RNA sequence: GAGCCCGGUACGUGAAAACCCGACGUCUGUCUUGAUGGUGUUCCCGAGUAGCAGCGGGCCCGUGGAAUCUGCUGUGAAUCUGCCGGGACCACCCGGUAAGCCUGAAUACUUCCCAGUGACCGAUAGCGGAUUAGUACCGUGAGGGAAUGGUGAAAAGUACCCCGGGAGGGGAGUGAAAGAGUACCUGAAACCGUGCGCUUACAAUCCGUCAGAGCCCUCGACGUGUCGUGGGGUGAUGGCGUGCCUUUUGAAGAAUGAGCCUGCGAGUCAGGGACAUGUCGCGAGGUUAACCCGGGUGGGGUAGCCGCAGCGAAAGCGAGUCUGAAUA
RNA sequence: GGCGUCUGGGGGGAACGCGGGGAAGUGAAACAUCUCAGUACCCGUAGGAAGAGAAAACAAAAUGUGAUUCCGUGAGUAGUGG
């Protein structure tokens, strides 16, 4: 009968801490620090490079803009597709969404890179070519929303 | 599978309560159980706990005396921490023990904790603790000797089992909780459980559905 | 919870303060001086421990030697003929034959002069 | 408070599909007559991040 | 160290009067000289206002291509095929109807009152303030600002005698204890004495350490003192021996700091932060935030977040993709 | 302007609100744009709460939401910046 007294954590798991400045016997008068200097009292910030000029100012920045506009699609292989629905039939968005292919609430775009082998019909965002030759190819039908 | 057989305050058998596999049958496991119990003390403790630093403590606004010449150590102010009376450097200071554990954790230490109670058949099922209508302290302390002769035990009766919750309120070793409040502290705490049998079905109800 | 410094420091101070007994001023009063005439007194009872073989060796070399020479031998000579006819008796009983048994001793240099070579300056 | 990335570090450096950190090589703006094209063809495009940066510019983007 | 001694607790009870919440009324206004769905035209729909220009403020936006909002100075319209907004601007569509006014709830806080709580402190702590406390004291003034808790169960606080001017003490008593006497629980260290044992006035001592004669004490055995798998104290004498810490190439010091003791005095916390590494749950899934319901540590809560496909500045394509006239 | 007669105001308060004025030490390893910070402080005012509040609103072709306020996400993102 497992008490209040028999909980122990697992082996391992706890570790103790670390107490610096506590005599010479485990670290001791300097804590870990060395000698004197900027290190030594506060600190050295990261984008900090000695005056030289640092590597995040003297490169170029990336080229480009980002399209606010830009539409991205969650992407299913027919791969998934045949693993996920060995006995075929009509797969729309949110048997997917159940299957835990896509995410629940976003765009669905069909991607050829598995095998299909079993007649499925399909209704997604988009299809990739590959992808509408694979599923036309065992029979089934690829429409679009 | 394991079957409890329901007893009565009249000392004779009633019928039969069928516990679940997955909820009286599942292996302990210590380190969970473990865990979850820390993050249940940890959240029952109030961090009220505090301490003035060099900044909140009254007066020091002003510096002492000369720097120099006066040959003696240089001060800033007079509640500096090696200053008797002067703040506090790395004090206590008010804060939250809670935990987040998830609640598969918390829900599968339960089980675990039910399950070894129920391995060595320390969980009883009733319908009444005593006879109803008005609570009577030795009445229950009868029965409750009749069904254990432990020390602590748990009594988990619906919130409006009033006759026995004031019944068995007054005993030391008997703590009584709500079928929903539930936790693995309390299991764990108690040699034996008493379950009612509203109290217990309501409780595989909720879980096994 | 507050946790006062008394007994942990007590503790160190009262064995120190008992493991100088016998000090001279501050030394057996202070804590301080009395951890630092510790750490000194330790280090000097480790050095003198490894000094104190040689110096009972030299010791025993001493009363060896002089036992000797009062049979018309030195030492040299005396540990050279002792280890050339096989005796393995080491200089502390070797010492102590010559203080209480002088007659063993007689009879150790008679047996150390016969190991000993005709010519000891021979390239032999 | 939720920690704060850097801006200059953001623009300037990239991440490919396996976490690689990923930067633009300089000397490509201007004064570009003097230097023959396969100056600036070995200077176009993107390299990975050398392993002694690897570290301040992770520490940076995060 | 009390559930059964007391105050109390669970549980029930109680308001003359005052005040606060409701309810029903007197009372007040208000519609009933009213209501409906139809047809084609003139008027009205908030003016020194909107708009514009100059100089500013604030918006992710630091004047920038700078939209919406707003202050001052000039200029200054329209009333619905009117006007404003949809990040310069123009056209089309869409949304709305400025230059008039009121509006409860969800939200923030505690001078003060009531009831509790604490892996908070326990007299150098906790409020500066457990005691005359914002007092004493300091400064003309704004202002600064302390220190001081505990006899005993009950005062039963030592009648009486003696020494003494008293203070103080010795007897005698009270008390379980006066090694509790209103200088009072426990009574450490620094510091100052008294008594005993050893040693010290021919001696150059980081004051100790290793050998060590002698003297004293003590534990056993055997005789009358003498050894022993003994232990202690002090030690004449010999060998060795340049205090500690910091900063240093390097300091026993003639580089720095410390008169001593007792208390206090320095890597801590918050954030679904970031990285790395243990450990536990679940596992192509994991997980909830706010919030709701539980006198709890429990249950619910899919909004989100991280994985699940990458390449490209981007359009986009996609196990491929970018550059490229090119399978180069 | 004077006279007489009635009704109001004046000051205090620990925090919270609204509307104005508004620094510097600091960081940028210097410093002036910038930050600190609309913070500290000052001024005028309330209330038990205050302010806002009923589209001259968002949105993007959805036959879409429908006063204000507050909390969590969105997100340290889009951007902005010697």
Do not use: A, D, I, W
């Given at each position: 009968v497992i008490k209040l007294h028999d909980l122990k954590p697992a082996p391992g798991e706890k570790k103790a801490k670390t107490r610096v400045?506590?005599?010479?016997?485990?670290?001791?008068?300097?804590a870990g620090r060395g000698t004197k200097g900027t290190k030594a009292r506060k600190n050295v910030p990261?984008?900090?490079?000695?005056?030289?000029?640092?590597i995040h100012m003297r490169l170029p920045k990336l080229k480009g803009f980002k399209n606010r506009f830009r539409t991205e699609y969650q992407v299913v292989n027919v791969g998934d597709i045949n693993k996920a629905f060995p006995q075929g039939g009509t797969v729309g968005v949110d048997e997917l969404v159940a299957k835990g292919?896509?995410?629940?609430?976003s765009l669905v775009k069909v991607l050829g890179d598995g095998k299909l082998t079993v007649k499925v019909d399909v209704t997604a965002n988009k299809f990739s070519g590959s992808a509408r030759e694979a599923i036309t190819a065992a029979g089934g039908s690829a429409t679009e929303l | 599978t394991l079957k409890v057989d329901v007893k009565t305050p009249a000392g004779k058998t009633d019928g039969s309560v069928e516990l679940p596999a997955e909820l009286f049958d599942v292996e302990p496991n210590i380190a969970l159980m473990h865990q979850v119990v820390t993050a249940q003390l940890a959240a029952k403790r109030q961090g009220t706990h505090s301490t003035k630093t060099r900044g909140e403590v009254s007066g020091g606004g002003k510096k002492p005396?000369?720097?120099?010449?006066?040959?003696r150590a240089r001060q800033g102010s007079t509640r500096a921490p090696q200053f008797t009376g002067g703040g506090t450097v790395h004090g206590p200071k008010p804060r939250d023990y809670s935990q987040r554990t998830p609640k598969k954790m918390i829900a599968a230490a339960l089980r675990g904790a039910l399950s070894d109670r129920a391995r060595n058949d320390r969980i009883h099922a009733v319908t009444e603790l005593v006879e109803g209508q008005t609570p009577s302290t030795k009445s229950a302390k009868t029965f409750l000797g009749t069904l254990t002769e432990n020390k602590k035990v748990l009594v988990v009766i619906g919130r409006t089992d009033e006759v026995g919750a004031k019944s068995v309120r007054n005993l030391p070793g008997v703590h009584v909780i709500s079928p929903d409040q539930l936790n693995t502290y309390d299991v764990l705490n108690a040699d034996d459980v008493v379950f009612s049998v509203e109290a217990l079905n309501a409780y595989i109800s909720a879980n096994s559905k | 919870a507050r946790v006062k410094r008394a007994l942990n420091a007590q503790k160190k101070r009262r064995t120190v303060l008992k493991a100088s007994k016998g000090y001279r001023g501050q030394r057996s009063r202070l804590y301080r001086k009395a951890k630092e005439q510790q750490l000194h007194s330790l280090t000097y009872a480790y050095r003198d421990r490894r000094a104190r073989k040689g110096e009972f060796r030299k010791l025993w070399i001493s009363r060896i030697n002089a036992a000797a020479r009062a049979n018309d031998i030195t030492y040299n000579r005396l540990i050279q003929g002792l280890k050339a006819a096989g005796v393995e008796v080491d200089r502390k009983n070797l010492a102590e034959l010559a203080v209480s048994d002088p007659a063993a001793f007689t009879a150790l240099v008679d047996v150390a002069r016969a190991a000993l070579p005709e010519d000891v300056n021979a390239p032999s | 408070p939720k920690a704060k990335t850097h801006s200059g570090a953001s623009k300037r450096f990239r991440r490919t599909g396996t976490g690689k950190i990923v930067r633009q090589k300089a000397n490509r703006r201007h004064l570009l007559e003097h230097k023959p094209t396969k100056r600036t063809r070995r200077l176009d495009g993107r390299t990975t991040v050398s392993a002694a940066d690897n570290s301040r510019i992770n520490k940076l983007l995060n």
């Open positions: 400045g506590r005599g010479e016997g485990s670290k001791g008068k300097t990261v984008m900090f490079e000695g005056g030289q000029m640092p292919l896509v995410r629940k609430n | 005396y000369r720097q120099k010449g006066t040959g | - | -």
